[PDB]
Design a protein around this nucleic acid. Structure first.
Ligand code: MG
Ligand code: MG
Ligand code: MG
Ligand code: MG
Ligand code: MG
Ligand code: MG
Ligand code: MG
Ligand code: MG
Ligand code: MG
Ligand code: MG
Ligand code: MG
Ligand code: MG
Ligand code: MG
Ligand code: MG
Ligand code: MG
Ligand code: MG
Ligand code: MG
Ligand code: MG
Ligand code: MG
Ligand code: MG
Ligand code: MG
Ligand code: MG
Ligand code: MG
Ligand code: MG
Ligand code: MG
Ligand code: MG
Ligand code: MG
Ligand code: MG
Ligand code: MG
Ligand code: MG
Ligand code: MG
Ligand code: MG
Ligand code: MG
Ligand code: MG
Ligand code: MG
Ligand code: MG
Ligand code: MG
Ligand code: MG
Ligand code: MG
Ligand code: MG
Lengths: 129, 150, 145
RNA sequence: GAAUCUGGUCAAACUUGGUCAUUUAGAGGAACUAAAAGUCGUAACAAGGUUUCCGUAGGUGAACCUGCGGAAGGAUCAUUA
RNA sequence: GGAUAGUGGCCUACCAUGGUUUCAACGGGUAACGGGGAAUAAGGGUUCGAUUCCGGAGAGGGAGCCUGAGAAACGGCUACCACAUCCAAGGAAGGCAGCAGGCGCGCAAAUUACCCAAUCCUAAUUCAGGGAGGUAGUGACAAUAAAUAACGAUACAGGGCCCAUUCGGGUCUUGUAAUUGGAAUGAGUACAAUGUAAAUACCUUAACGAGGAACAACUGGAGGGCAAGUCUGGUGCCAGCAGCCGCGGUAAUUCCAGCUCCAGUAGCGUAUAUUAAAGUUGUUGCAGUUAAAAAGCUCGUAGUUGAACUUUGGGUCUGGUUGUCCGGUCGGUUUUUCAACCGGAUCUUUCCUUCUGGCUAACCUGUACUCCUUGUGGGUGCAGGCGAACCAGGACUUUUACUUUGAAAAAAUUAGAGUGUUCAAAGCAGGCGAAAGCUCGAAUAUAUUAGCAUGGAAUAAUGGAAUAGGACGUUUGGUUCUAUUUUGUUGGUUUCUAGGACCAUCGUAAUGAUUAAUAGGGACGGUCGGGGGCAUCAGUAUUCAAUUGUCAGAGGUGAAAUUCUUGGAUUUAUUGAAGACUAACUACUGCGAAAGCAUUUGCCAAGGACGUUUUCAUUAAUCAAGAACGAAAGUUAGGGGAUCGAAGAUGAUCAGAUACCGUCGUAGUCUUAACCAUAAACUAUGCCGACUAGGGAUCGGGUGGUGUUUUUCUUAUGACCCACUCGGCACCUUACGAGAAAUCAAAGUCUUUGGGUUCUGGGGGGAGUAUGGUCGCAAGGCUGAAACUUAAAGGAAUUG
């Protein structure tokens, strides 16, 4: 089966961005996807993206910016206990300096810097660097 | 990529953009609903019905014109059968292989398939039991399945 | 690829049962879990063993090199088992003599043969309460006969 | 209010068996490993001088051989009409 | 019921048949007391915890009990076993896993010392006692701190150099000499006083106490790994070292000795564990085409995993919190010009759980209208009444996971703040006066497993109205209540009534089902196939036999032989039987879960793809248990046996050869009824899932071409061309991607490490063995060891 759509989508992104396609298509297209992408937009790893409504399921067209390096997804959505964020981001992203860890939470879908300001953690989805 | 075989098809119906009606194809919701419940008393199944509605008459989907699907129409008039449509068509086939094996003791690749169809039924039954269509503590098989058919 | 192992947020058991039952091909873990040290390994899973020199043997070594190695068959005290201990340094089985209490050591290799001495897994240390190196170098002297 | 004493009860232990576990003599057998290096061949590696293999039967003095099927890790990615 | 202090299958009676289990019950093991903790030490972890604290047990075993608040006590007793003491043989006394000591065991561990002064504890208790506890001894368990000379001068050499016609003074600074010289120092002793229970030792010193002979550093190493001997004598494949590599045959840089030298240094080695290194156990984080490793295949329960969809956005104010704008100030502080950031209240088709009442704080007020700058600056003030300003009781909560801060997670440990133990290791001390009294401390953090608390509502699950028995209420009837409050107080009966609950009927509302996943199933359609079962047909073949014909050989040969008939074998032709196979086509073709499947038609059901404005609506993927099939061989049991043909005979060859070849040829082969259940069952590539690159083809579906030809005039099928498309089977080039490479468009999207799942592997062997299951008629399978052994076994490629 097609399991984690988010992953299965971000995989296409990661393939697209690897070759230098200026865009990608993403079949299934969720809230999470869009709130994940929305996050990439707010930092700037991603251009426009255009959610098609198949009178049906979803479908997205992303515009890549040549800025994504990796559009990570961590797989069993591990629960994170606020301090353990530091151990995830340390182990996933290059450097204390720059990068983001896209985590769903009580607050919605933040990145790990926004989630530290708020003082609210939860599950992880993926990351970007 | 198929349940049982290793053949990975997308033989499929597409479904058009419009949840709304294709206006010009006329008739009525009630007229089509009365059209359907004739065929429900003639014995034809939702899947057969909707072909007949589509092929000859101007229906695209009952979903479209009536609002309700078809089984949901038939249920509303008390004409949906005890054993569901899809399951019944497998329970038929099961019998039509259990019958062929009783005659042909030595025939392996039919025994193989019979083990599939049986399993396919117990997939579907176990689904239906959990829905609460068929009552539970009720197994749909082989000896009594011939009686469940006819 | 999914990479073999399961990845569910609720897997755990199919990890933790798998890693119990693969470990078993890790030879470190197997000896620890099955007490080969205790049930076998002449020394009782122990640093050392006092054991009486039953005879001074000369053991003709494996190939490349060629030398008769000057060893001692021992009878380990506690277990009553018999082993064969090497005697390090020029002669020094001369210093060992016959029917002495001899404290043994592992050779180094966690069982197994040290180098070319085929079927000898032990070094003599103390002969009747001294130390071969103390005899060999003659910083200490033997307690008479 | 003592010894004494009638039932109970808890139940050590013994007796004489039965039973699991761990130890441990054991005539004999049958192995497997190290080897100084000896016999007998020389199986495999070269198309290794019957191409190797595998499965599986039979046979032998040993490697081994021979059926059958399979595989090339083949001694061939090749014959067109 | 009995017992117990008490709850209880704790015990007893009678009754019922439960209870646990693959989310590992039960059993076994443990060289297992649990926890605190310990070591290791990026993160994640692993291993250890007998041992200073907290629990629990035990006092040689196993029982039983007295007293007592508290004992199933053992520095109490009774007994039996096991062990042993003392005897005048009648009988007595025992229990160090308290302390000390000894044996024994063992690689392995202290003195039958001095004390209650501390610490605490106990009693009839200031007063007694305490191997609890302290004090030493022994003590290289650990750990902390650091002497093994320092400064001269003269005497011989290195370095700066005023200048270098050659020097050299050496004016300035460093190193070497059994020179020599002045100046300390505790290592030790010892009056004393400290210290102390008394002492020691420590800190402190009266008095002595250094001159190379003393008041002395060892350990290991000195080819590489890995820091450092091609020094001098031996040694001579020995003796030896050597973790590993390896060294040793007369110049061995590895053995053994002297001098050098290295490393560490009052320590360092060795052995076994163990952690790291080990991403060589992998959750993070490994491998599986070939190196070890994908079950032969499919099904399949548990497990684990599982498409998308429901409240988004905009405004309006209002609290902070640091950068700014000057220091407005006596290096610090308070606003504004500004900021981002985090909230809060709301309003947006919007409720945040709702009421029965308490407190309605407040003015939405306006009852008299004014203390009063010409005023909507300002408040004595109470009938209607905004309730969030709190309670105190209902009503009933979709439930979880998840995450928050909180409460708790004994102390020591762990991290860590404060502090002159002389430094530290530590410790909980300390600090400042008139030095007549005063005075800071003894933190904080962690520990995330479970429970409890509260916020949050993404994520994930779960749930609700589709027979609506649904939701509400001005319903209007009812039905069953329940029942307190007054009728003087009790027992009623029925009310008024206010609260349940339950069928009616009248209305209200937008009345109530999300998709219809390039998920899946199922229906339909035309097809497709060497798919399967059962049934027939062929070719034609080989064989024997028949009848037929023709008179010397025909077979065989691997080069060469043997071997057979002639009373025509063979050869030629007609048949017959039998049981086989089922060519040529036949391909980088088809189908099948694989195994496997090609002559024919027929039947039997099944099936993929396809198409589909069909239908259900989460049924799905993978899967330990279990199953279904499963080449050949083998096996029982049948039929047949042509040829080949495991066995055998037998003819040559070779030193020989029961081996090829040669000739024959049972078992089989073939089949039918049973089993077996493995193969290089190999694409040596698990399944699903997505996405990345073109080329051209290739085929099975499907579209479009005034295309071409067929030609029976337009044709219409068919058959191509060309372009693109769903499905299948494989190549070419670059790889910028992978990969150890071979290679691979998957073996890519992996140290820029995470889509889901199942399985397997952890040097080689020993070994697919031993054993035990379990399965088999058996063969054998499945399952599956270690001891022991060994430094390589491999893989891929390079040159030879
Ligand atoms: Mg598909
Ligand atoms: Mg399936
Ligand atoms: Mg040799
Ligand atoms: Mg009694
Ligand atoms: Mg040849
Ligand atoms: Mg050979
Ligand atoms: Mg050969
Ligand atoms: Mg009772
Ligand atoms: Mg124990
Ligand atoms: Mg433990
Ligand atoms: Mg403990
Ligand atoms: Mg113990
Ligand atoms: Mg204790
Ligand atoms: Mg004892
Ligand atoms: Mg007792
Ligand atoms: Mg006691
Ligand atoms: Mg005692
Ligand atoms: Mg003792
Ligand atoms: Mg000791
Ligand atoms: Mg004590
Ligand atoms: Mg001492
Ligand atoms: Mg000193
Ligand atoms: Mg030395
Ligand atoms: Mg040396
Ligand atoms: Mg070096
Ligand atoms: Mg040495
Ligand atoms: Mg380790
Ligand atoms: Mg590995
Ligand atoms: Mg392999
Ligand atoms: Mg979802
Ligand atoms: Mg500390
Ligand atoms: Mg013949
Ligand atoms: Mg074909
Ligand atoms: Mg044919
Ligand atoms: Mg299985
Ligand atoms: Mg066969
Ligand atoms: Mg033969
Ligand atoms: Mg196999
Ligand atoms: Mg395999
Ligand atoms: Mg092994």
């Amino acid at each position: 089966t097609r399991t984690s759509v988010l992953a299965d989508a971000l995989n296409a992104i990661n393939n697209a961005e690897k070759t230098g396609k200026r865009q990608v298509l993403i079949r299934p297209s969720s809230k999470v996807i869009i709130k994940f992408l929305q996050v990439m937009q707010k930092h700037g790893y991603i251009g426009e993206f255009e959610y098609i409504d198949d009178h049906r399921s979803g479908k997205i067209v992303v515009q890549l910016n040549g800025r994504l390096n990796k559009c990570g997804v961590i797989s069993p959505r591990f629960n994170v206990k606020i301090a353990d964020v530091e151990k995830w981001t340390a182990n996933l992203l290059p450097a204390r300096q720059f990068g983001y860890v896209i985590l769903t939470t009580s607050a919605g879908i933040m990145d790990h810097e926004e989630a530290h300001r708020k003082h609210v953690s939860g599950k992880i989805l993926g990351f970007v660097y | 990529g198929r349940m049982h075989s290793k053949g990975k098809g997308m033989s499929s119906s597409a479904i058009p953009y419009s949840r709304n009606a294709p206006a010009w194809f006329k008739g009525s919701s009630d007229g089509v609903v009365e059209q359907i419940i004739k065929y429900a008393r003639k014995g034809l199944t939702p899947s057969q019905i909707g072909v007949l509605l589509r092929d000859a008459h101007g229906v695209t989907q009952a979903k479209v014109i009536t609002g309700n699907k078809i089984l949901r129409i038939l249920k509303s008039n008390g004409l949906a059968p005890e054993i569901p449509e899809d399951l019944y068509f497998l329970i038929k086939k099961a019998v039509s292989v259990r019958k062929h094996l009783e005659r042909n003791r030595k025939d392996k690749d039919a025994k193989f398939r019979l083990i599939l169809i049986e399993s396919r039924i117990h997939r579907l039954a176990r689904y239906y039991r959990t829905v609460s269509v068929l009552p539970p503590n009720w197994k749909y098989e082989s000896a009594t399945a011939s009686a469940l058919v006819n | 690829m999914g990479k073999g192992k399961p990845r569910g947020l609720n897997s755990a058991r199919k990890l933790r049962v798998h890693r119990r039952n693969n470990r078993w091909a890790e030879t470190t873990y197997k000896k620890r879990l099955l007490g080969t040290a205790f049930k076998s390994s002449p020394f009782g899973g122990s640093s050392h063993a006092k054991g009486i020199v039953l005879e001074k043997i000369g053991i003709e070594s494996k190939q490349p090199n060629s030398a008769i190695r000057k060893c001692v068959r021992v009878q380990l005290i506690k277990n009553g088992k018999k082993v064969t201990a090497f005697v390090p340094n020029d002669g020094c089985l001369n210093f060992v003599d016959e029917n002495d209490e001899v404290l043994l050591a592992g050779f180094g290799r966690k069982g197994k043969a040290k180098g070319d001495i085929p079927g000898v897994r032990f070094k003599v240390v103390k002969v009747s309460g001294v130390s071969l190196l103390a005899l060999w170098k003659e910083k200490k002297e033997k307690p008479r006969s």
